[PDB]
A paper describes a structure:
Of particular interest in this regard is the putative centriolar CPAP–STIL complex, as mutations in both components result in MCPH. CPAP and STIL are strictly required for centriole assembly: STIL at a very early stage and CPAP slightly later, possibly by controlling the organisation and length of the centriolar microtubules. Instead, we demonstrate that the TCP domain of CPAP constitutes a novel proline-rich-motif (PRM) recognition-domain that specifically binds to a short target motif in STIL. Our mutational analysis of the interface demonstrates a remarkable correlation between the ability of mutant proteins to bind to one another in vitro and their ability to support centriole assembly in vivo, providing compelling support for our structural model of the metazoan CPAP–STIL complex. These data strongly suggest that the interaction between CPAP and STIL is a conserved, essential step in centriole biogenesis.
Intriguingly, a MCPH mutation (E1235V) in the conserved C-terminal domain of CPAP (the so-called TCP-domain or G-Box) appeared to weaken this yeast-two-hybrid interaction. The involvement of CPAP E1021 in the interaction with STIL in zebrafish is potentially significant, as the equivalent residue in human CPAP (E1235) is mutated to valine in some MCPH patients. To test whether this mutation disrupts the organisation of the TCP domain, we obtained the crystal structure of D. rerio CPAP937–1124 carrying the E1021V mutation. The structure of the wild-type and the mutant TCP domain were virtually identical (RMSD = 0.1 Å over 142 Cα pairs) demonstrating that the TCP domain structure was not compromised. ITC experiments with WT D. rerio STIL404–448 showed that the mutation of residues F978, Y994, and F1015 decreased the binding strength by ∼20 to 40-fold, while mutation of E1021 decreased the binding strength by approximately eightfold. Taken together these results lend strong support to our structural model and indicate that the E1021V MCPH mutation leads to roughly an order of magnitude decrease in affinity of the CPAP–STIL interaction. The structures we report here reveal that E1235 is one of the several residues involved in the binding interface with STIL, making an important sidechain–mainchain contact. This structural model explains how the E1235V mutation can compromise complex formation, and we have confirmed that this is the case with zebrafish proteins in vitro.
Residue numbers in the entry: 954 to 1124
């Protein structure tokens, strides 16, 4: 049950059972250090809880009920109250998994990819919006209005903006 009061008012007190080292900082921050070396830190101003594990993993819990987990591999995973999980990868990719299973990926090249739970995949770039279907069919609409269908057979059919076929090839 040791107690140290530092000249600045910060208190360090061991729990009655000897297991938790509790620091109450003069600014209202509180730190608990556990036997397994887990550190739990409450930031009073931000009202945020920050847990640091021995392996270096960190988890933050914010007032708005968001959680952010920092993984040793460099990923940062943000969980929203509604169950949406957003992962930030080291390469700059951001992938959100919605509660219905939909995946929305934001890529460092400007593109947005949506993977629907039906297998269908939508790719949006500055130059086109493309839909890929599980069988191998691809429909691409260009910013200029041209439309290309690739069939799983190798056939590629291209149409002008009015829908007139201007190219239809197959090997």
């Amino acid at each position: 049950g040791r107690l140290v009061v530092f000249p600045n008012g910060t208190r360090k007190e061991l729990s009655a059972d000897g297991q938790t080292v509790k620091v109450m900082f003069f600014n209202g921050d509180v730190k608990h250090t556990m036997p397994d070396q887990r550190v739990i830190y409450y930031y009073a101003e931000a009202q945020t809880t920050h847990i640091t594990y021995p392996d270096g993993m960190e988890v933050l819990q914010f007032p708005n009920n968001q959680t952010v987990k920092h993984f040793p591999d460099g990923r940062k995973e943000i969980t929203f109250p509604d169950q949406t999980v957003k992962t930030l990868h080291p390469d700059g990719r951001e992938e959100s998994v919605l509660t219905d299973g939909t995946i929305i990926q934001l890529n460092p090249d400007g593109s947005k990819v949506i993977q629907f739970n039906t297998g269908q995949r939508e790719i949006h770039t500055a130059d086109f919006k493309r839909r890929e279907y599980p069988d191998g069919t691809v429909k691409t609409v260009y910013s200029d209005g041209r439309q290309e269908t690739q069939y799983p057979t190798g056939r590629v059919r291209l149409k002008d903006p009015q829908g007139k076929v201007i190219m239809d090839t197959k090997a």
